[PDB]
């Protein structure tokens, strides 16, 4: 059954109880406060809803996921990256990035003003991180998400220049993999997610990786704002 | 003579040369950078100064200290905690905890903007940690400090609801003891700190503990964001 959240509790219902159709719908209401969001991510839940509607929480089954090493990179893209015109930094402009994704008319709809301020908050508290792609001094691409130990929950990505988000993702994965990263959550499997090399795994499996991975960890300074790639 | 620290290098004078009145006043100037602060904690020094004043570094003698096990808990508090209405978490909102302490108009003036930023960096690098106390969807209390092996240097705590900060310390001590935490530095002795069970030990006694406990270690992932207690 669909649980109505309220200001009284920050907890969530067991995901095993999410609806079948729409795939994942678990609860609604509450708010997008930091503590509630973390509470959600740690239980394999995430918010998604359009402007005007109440907050919706999901935990779909199967779950979209991306194993860093299985990231698909075309022969063409490698040639591009070997002579990349982009620079990739970490946590330099979280705001510009999420704003870029929100700006995307075709996919940024669910990124309302309330969602933006919410994740910016998680960013300032150090749980949300952004990968930025620069061409000269102009942000032309990026991605962002929530970290859970060796698990990364991908929120969204955007691009204003050819191959910008592929670079963000290509570089992040190298970094992530090289320091102990394990999995990237793509939430739902679709044309975009599938093109990156994401695959579906049962929810029960995702939750078990979740509880396992948020306990594991990366270098003390892994999420510190820095440059990840420069030509 | 109060040594005037140099910007050029990170280096403190022996705590023994500190003044006797004001207790511990040992040095001034320098900066609030990660390496200098981390250095301060190593040697038993800590910054404390009011806005519109130069950086002041202290090493009081005697030093206030709290042995995890000697933490005092009244019968009413136990009765209260048994049916606690609070949720306690670790490293969920460091920024919000420190900001809470800094907002306490009674004893938070010393937590200047430069200090908040300074400790945000330590939290970023994984040395500074917080403990948040939630009532429903609200942050009603908490505490934060700098980890030093098995020793925890408490910096400050705040409270917006009866027994909030006691709950924070109570859950912390249990968790801390459970994984080998040995001592909690309280810096100076006050009424609240003493009521909790804190006490005074000579500076040179504290310094030996520090040098010893700094070496000891806690479980690699003791500080990962998580829930320590839920109502
Ligand atoms: N159904 C649904 N729920 C939530 N977000 C959704 C969604 N359909 C699309 N989107 C978002 C996310 C997606 O980007 C992604 O590929 C992410 N799901 C995963 C990701 C994020 C960041 C780095 C790597 C992987 C965008 C479309 O670009 O829209
Ligand atoms: N002289 C002096 N030096 C440092 N901090 C001081 C201070 N006078 C007041 N305060 C702060 C800290 C104090 O809280 C504490 O007891 C901490 N020193 C130790 C602590 C911190 C967090 C958790 C556990 C223990 C507060 C009083 O509320 O003001």
From Swiss-Prot, chains A, B:
Organism: Escherichia coli (strain K12)
InterPro entries registered for this protein in UniProt: Acyl_CoA_acyltransferase (IPR016181), Leu/Phe-tRNA_Trfase (IPR004616), Leu/Phe-tRNA_Trfase_C (IPR042203), Leu/Phe-tRNA_Trfase_N (IPR042221)
BP GO terms, sorted: protein catabolic process
Top-level EC class as recorded in UniProt: transferase
Official protein name in the record: Leucyl/phenylalanyl-tRNA--protein transferase
Catalytic reactions on record: N-terminal L-lysyl-[protein] + L-leucyl-tRNA(Leu) = N-terminal L-leucyl-L-lysyl-[protein] + tRNA(Leu) + H(+); N-terminal L-arginyl-[protein] + L-leucyl-tRNA(Leu) = N-terminal L-leucyl-L-arginyl-[protein] + tRNA(Leu) + H(+); L-phenylalanyl-tRNA(Phe) + an N-terminal L-alpha-aminoacyl-[protein] = an N-terminal L-phenylalanyl-L-alpha-aminoacyl-[protein] + tRNA(Phe)
Primary location recorded for the protein, binned into one broad class: cytoplasm
Subunit structure: Monomer.
Matches recorded under NCBIfam families: aat
């Amino acid at each position: 059954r669909l649980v109505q959240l309220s200001r009284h509790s920050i907890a969530f219902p067991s995901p095993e109880g999410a609806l079948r159709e729409p795939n994942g719908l678990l609860a609604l209401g509450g708010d997008l406060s930091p503590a509630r969001l973390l509470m959600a991510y740690q239980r394999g839940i995430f918010p998604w809803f359009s402007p005007g509607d109440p907050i919706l929480w999901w935990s779909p089954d199967p779950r979209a996921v991306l194993w860093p090493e299985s990231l698909h990179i075309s022969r063409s893209m490698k040639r591009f990256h070997k002579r990349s015109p982009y620079r990739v930094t970490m946590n330099y402009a979280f705001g510009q990035v999420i704003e870029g994704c929100a700006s995307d008319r075709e996919e940024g709809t669910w990124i309302t003003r309330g969602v933006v301020e919410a994740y910016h908050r998680l960013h300032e508290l150090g749980h949300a991180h952004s990968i930025e792609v620069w061409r000269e001094d102009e942000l032309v691409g990026g991605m962002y998400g929530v970290a859970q130990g060796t698990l990364f929950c991908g929120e969204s990505m955007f691009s204003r220049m050819e191959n910008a988000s592929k670079t963000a993702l290509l570089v992040f994965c190298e970094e992530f993999i090289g320091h102990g990263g394990k999995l990237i959550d793509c939430q739902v499997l679709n044309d975009h997610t599938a093109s990156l090399g994401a695959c579906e795994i049962p929810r029960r499996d995702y939750l078990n990786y979740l509880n396992q991975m948020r306990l594991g960890r990366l270098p003390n300074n892994f999420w510190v704002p820095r440059c990840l790639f420069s030509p």
